[PDB]
Amino acid sequence: SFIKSLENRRTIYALGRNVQDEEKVIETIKEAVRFSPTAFNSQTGRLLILTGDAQDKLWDEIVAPELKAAMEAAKLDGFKAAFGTILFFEDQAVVKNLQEQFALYADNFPVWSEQGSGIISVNVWTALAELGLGANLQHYNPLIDEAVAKEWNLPESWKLRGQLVFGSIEAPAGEKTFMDDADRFIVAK
Amino acid sequence: SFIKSLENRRTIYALGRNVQDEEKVIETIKEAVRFSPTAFNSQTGRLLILTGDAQDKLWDEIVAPELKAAMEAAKLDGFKAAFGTILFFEDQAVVKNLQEQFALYADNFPVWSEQGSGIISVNVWTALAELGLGANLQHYNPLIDEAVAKEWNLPESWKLRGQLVFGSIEAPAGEKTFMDDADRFIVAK
Numbered sequence: 580s581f582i583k584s585l586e587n588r589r590t591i592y593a594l595g596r597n598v599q600d601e602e603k604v605i606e607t608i609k610e611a612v613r614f615s616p617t618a619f620n621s622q623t624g625r626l627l628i629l630t631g632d633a634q635d636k637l638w639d640e641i642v643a644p645e646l647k648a649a650m651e652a653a654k655l656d657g658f659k660a661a662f663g664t665i666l667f668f669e670d671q672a673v674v675k676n677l678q679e680q681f682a683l684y685a686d687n688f689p690v691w692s693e694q695g696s697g698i699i700s701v702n703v704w705t706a707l708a709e710l711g712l713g714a715n716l717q718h719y720n721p722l723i724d725e726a727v728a729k730e731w732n733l734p735e736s737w738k739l740r741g742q743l744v745f746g747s748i749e750a751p752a753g754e755k756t757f758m759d760d761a762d763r764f765i766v767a768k
Numbered sequence: 769s770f771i772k773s774l775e776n777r778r779t780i781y782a783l784g785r786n787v788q789d790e791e792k793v794i795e796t797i798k799e800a801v802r803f804s805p806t807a808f809n810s811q812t813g814r815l816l817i818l819t820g821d822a823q824d825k826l827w828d829e830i831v832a833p834e835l836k837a838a839m840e841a842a843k844l845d846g847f848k849a850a851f852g853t854i855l856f857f858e859d860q861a862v863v864k865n866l867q868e869q870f871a872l873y874a875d876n877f878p879v880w881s882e883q884g885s886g887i888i889s890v891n892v893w894t895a896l897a898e899l900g901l902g903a904n905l906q907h908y909n910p911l912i913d914e915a916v917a918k919e920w921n922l923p924e925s926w927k928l929r930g931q932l933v934f935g936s937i938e939a940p941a942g943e944k945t946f947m948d949d950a951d952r953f954i955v956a957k
C-alpha cells in the first residue's frame with residue numbers, strides 16, 4: 580500500500596554498492612520525478628545522477644576540499660561509500676520566466692519551486708526504498724555549487740537544493756519519534 | 769507499486785461528496801503526514817481538516833467574501849461542492865526555535881519548512897488518490913489566514929501554505945504534458 584511505501588522510506592546512513600540493476604534504479608528515479616506535481620506544471624526540477632567514478636569524484640575532489648576550505652574560515656567516507664548521489668536543482672530560468680509571465684504570482688514562484696524540490700526529493704527517496712535501497716539527504720549547497728556546475732557542465736540557471744546519497748542498506752535506520760496527533764491535527768465539521 | 773501510486777495522483781477539479789468512509793480518510797491523511805520526513809525531524813506541518821458544515825463555511829463565509837473584498841482593490845462553488853478541505857500550515861514557532869538552537873542553519877530552516885509543506889501536501893494528496901478520492905491544491909493564503917485562524921481558534925504561529933480540496937471524482941483529470949528527459953536528467957559515471 581502507499582502508506583506502507585511511505586513508512587518504508589527512512590534515512591539510512593550506512594550505505595554500500597550492492598546494487599543489482601542500475602538501469603532499473605535510473606528508470607525509477609526518472610519516473611518518480613516525472614509523476615511529481617509542480618505549480619503550473621512548470622517541472623522546475625533538474626537532476627544530476629552520479630555513480631561510480633563520478634560518485635568518488637564528487638566526495639573526494641569537491642565536497643571534501645570545499646568543506647575543509649570553508650571550516651578553516653569520516654562522514655564523507657560514508658557518503659562516498661554509497662552507490663551514488665542524486666543532486667537536485669531548481670531551474671531559476673523557468674522560475675524567472677514564470678515571474679515575468681504571471682507577475683501577480685511573482686513572489687510565490689520561488690516558494691512553489693522550493694516546495695517542488697522537496698516533493699521530487701522525497702518521491703525519489705521513497706521510490707528507491709521500494710527497490711530495497713536506502714538513502715539520506717544532505718545539504719552541502721551552496722558550498723559545492725560552482726565546482727559541481729563546472730565539472731559536469733551544468734547551466735548557470737540550475738540552483739542546487741539537495742543531494743540524495745543512495746545505495747544498498749548496510750545497517751538499519753535509527754530510532755525515530757513522532758509528535759502527539761493532538762498538537763498537529765485538528766478535525767472540524 | 770509506488771510509481772503507480774504517484775501516477776494515479778492527479779489534479780481533479782470536479783469533486784463531490786460520495787465518500788464512503790470518512791474515518792478511514794482522516795486516518796490516511798494523518799498517516800501520510802506522520803510518515804513524511806522533515807529537517808531535524810522537526811515535524812513543522814500542521815493540518816486543519818474541514819468537512820460538512822465547516823467545509824461550507826470556509827468557502828461561503830471566508831474565501832468568497834475575502835476574495836471579493838480583495839479583487840475590488842463559480843470556481844468557489846466547485847471547491848465548496850467537494851467533501852472537504854485540508855489546510856496545510858507550517859508552525860513558525862518551531863522554525864524560530866530551530867533558528868535559535870542551530871544559528872548556523874538559521875537561513876535554511878524557512879527553506880526546509882517550505883520543502884516540508886510540499887512534501888506532506890503531496891503525500892496526503894497521493895494517499896487520498898489511493899483511496900479513489902480526487903483532490904486539487906489551492907492558494908488563497910494569505911488572504912484568508914486571519915479569518916481561518918479566528919474561526920477555528922488556531923495558534924498565531926500556524927502559517928497557512930496551501931489548501932487541498934478533496935472528494936469523490938466526478939470527472940477525469942485533464943490532459944498533461946511532460947518535459948523531454950534530456951532537458952532535466954543528466955546521468956554521469
Ligand SMILES: Cc1cc2nc3c(=O)[nH]c(=O)nc-3n(C[C@H](O)[C@H](O)[C@H](O)COP(=O)(O)O)c2cc1C
Pocket residue numbers: 615616617618619620691692694695698777778779780886904905906907941944
Ligand atoms: C506547489 C504546488 C502548487 C500548486 N498550486 C495550485 C493552485 O494554486 N491552484 C490549482 O488549481 N493547482 C495548483 N497546483 C496543481 C498543479 O498545477 C498540478 O499539480 C500540475 O499542473 C500537474 O498536474 P497534476 O496535479 O494533474 O499531476 C499546484 C501544484 C504544486 C506542486
Ligand SMILES: Cc1cc2nc3c(=O)[nH]c(=O)nc-3n(C[C@H](O)[C@H](O)[C@H](O)COP(=O)(O)O)c2cc1C
Pocket residue numbers: 588589590591697715716717718752755804805806807808809880881883884887
Ligand atoms: C527538507 C529536509 C532536509 C533534510 N536535511 C538533512 C541533512 O542535511 N542531513 C541529514 O543527514 N538528514 C537530513 N534530513 C533527514 C531528516 O533528518 C529525516 O528525514 C528526519 O529525521 C526523519 O527521519 P527519516 O528520514 O528516517 O524518516 C532532511 C529531511 C528533510 C525532509
Ligand SMILES: O=[N+]([O-])c1cc[n+]([O-])c2ccccc12
Pocket residue numbers: 617618619620684907
Ligand atoms: O488556475 N490557476 O490559477 C492555477 C493553475 C495551476 N497552478 O499550478 C496554479 C499554481 C498557483 C496558482 C494558481 C494556479
Ligand SMILES: O=[N+]([O-])c1cc[n+]([O-])c2ccccc12
Pocket residue numbers: 592593653654655657658
Ligand atoms: O556515516 N555517516 O555519514 C553518518 C552516520 C551517522 N550519522 O548520524 C550521520 C549524521 C549526519 C551525517 C552523516 C552521518
Ligand SMILES: O=[N+]([O-])c1cc[n+]([O-])c2ccccc12
Pocket residue numbers: 718806807808809873
Ligand atoms: O546531522 N545533521 O547535520 C543533520 C541531521 C538531520 N537533519 O535533518 C539535518 C538537516 C539539515 C542540516 C543538517 C541535518
Ligand SMILES: O=[N+]([O-])c1cc[n+]([O-])c2ccccc12
Pocket residue numbers: 781782842843844846847
Ligand atoms: O471547478 N473549478 O473549480 C475549476 C475547474 C476547472 N479549472 O481549470 C479550474 C482551474 C483552477 C481553479 C479551479 C478550476
